[PDB]
Amino acid sequence: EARRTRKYLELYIVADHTLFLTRHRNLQHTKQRLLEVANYVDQLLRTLDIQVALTGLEVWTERDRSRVTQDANATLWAFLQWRRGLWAQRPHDSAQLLTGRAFQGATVGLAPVEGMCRAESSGGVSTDHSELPIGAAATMAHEIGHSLGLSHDPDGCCVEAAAESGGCVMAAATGHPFPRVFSACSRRQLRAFFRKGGGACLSNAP
Numbered sequence: 001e002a003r004r005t006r007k008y009l010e011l012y013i014v015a016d017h018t019l020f021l022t023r024h025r026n027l028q029h030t031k032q033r034l035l036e037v038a039n040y041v042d043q044l045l046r047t048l049d050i051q052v053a054l055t056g057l058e059v060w061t062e063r064d065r066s067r068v069t070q071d072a073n074a075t076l077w078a079f080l081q082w083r084r085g086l087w088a089q090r091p092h093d094s095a096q097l098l099t100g101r102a103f104q105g106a107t108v109g110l111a112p113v114e115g116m117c118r119a120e121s122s123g124g125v126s127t128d129h130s131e132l133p134i135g136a137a138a139t140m141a142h143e144i145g146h147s148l149g150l151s152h153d154p155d156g157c158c159v160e161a162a163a164e165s166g167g168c169v170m171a172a173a174t175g176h177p178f179p180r181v182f183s184a185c186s187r188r189q190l191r192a193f194f195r196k197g198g199g200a201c202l203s204n205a206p
């Protein structure tokens with residue numbers, strides 16, 4: 001056999017003010033939640049041969065630094081414009097906002113398609129919708145997938161996980177049991193993405 005070259009996603013994760021309020025204004029426990037969610041994101045992405053490197057953690061304890069509203073899309077781009085300033089001081093590949101608020105329209109997470117590594121769109125927003133950390137992580141990993149140009153899984157894609165096991169990450173539907181692996185279809189799409197020049201910033205080992 002042969003060894004595949006690993007990829008690394010330098011991740012910066014942010015907890016908005018509402019999530020902080022939800023965690024009873026406990027800074028330590030809010031940070032712990034972000035770390036646990038990142039941990040599950042790492043587990044999921046590893047099935048794509050991508051390892052997570054947590055660049056930074058940030059909790060908006062007194063005020064949101066970017067406007068977070070019921071509008072997932074508005075919230076996303078407001079966060080992405082804020083991410084630019086942050087990137088200059090603390091470089092990272094992708095910034096992810098975890099919010100305690102719910103979005104209008106049944107939306108649970110959102111990110112720009114194929115924006116991985118781009119200064120203007122390499123990030124995403126996810127709601128911490130489940131008591132379980134893996135819930136938000138699955139949502140965040142799904143959006144990172146979209147960021148990497150991955151589409152939702154077609155008809156018979158995802159054989160490496162059944163219903164009770166949570167299925168695959170790029171499934172069109174979300175809910176418990178949550179997914180822990182990306183389908184083979186997703187893995188092929190990712191290798192094509194890299195080969196074609198996408199996600200150039202995931203090459204350096206932190």
Ligand SMILES: *[C@@H]1O[C@H](CO)[C@@H](O[C@@H]2O[C@H](CO)[C@@H](O)[C@H](O)[C@H]2NC(C)=O)[C@H](O)[C@H]1NC(C)=O
Pocket residue numbers: 073074077
């Ligand atoms: C999500 O929100 C952004 C920002 O409001 C939308 O982007 C704007 O799109 C319009 C029309 O395409 C342009 O005139 C603006 O210049 C864009 N603003 C930018 C680039 O920041 C985007 O279309 C929205 N996505 C939706 C609702 O699907």
Ligand SMILES: [Ca+2]
Pocket residue numbers: 008009010092093201202203204
């Ligand atoms: Ca990098």
Ligand SMILES: [Cl-]
Pocket residue numbers: 191192195
């Ligand atoms: Cl290839």
Ligand SMILES: [Cl-]
Pocket residue numbers: 195196
């Ligand atoms: Cl080629």
Ligand SMILES: [Zn+2]
Pocket residue numbers: 142146152172
């Ligand atoms: Zn999707």
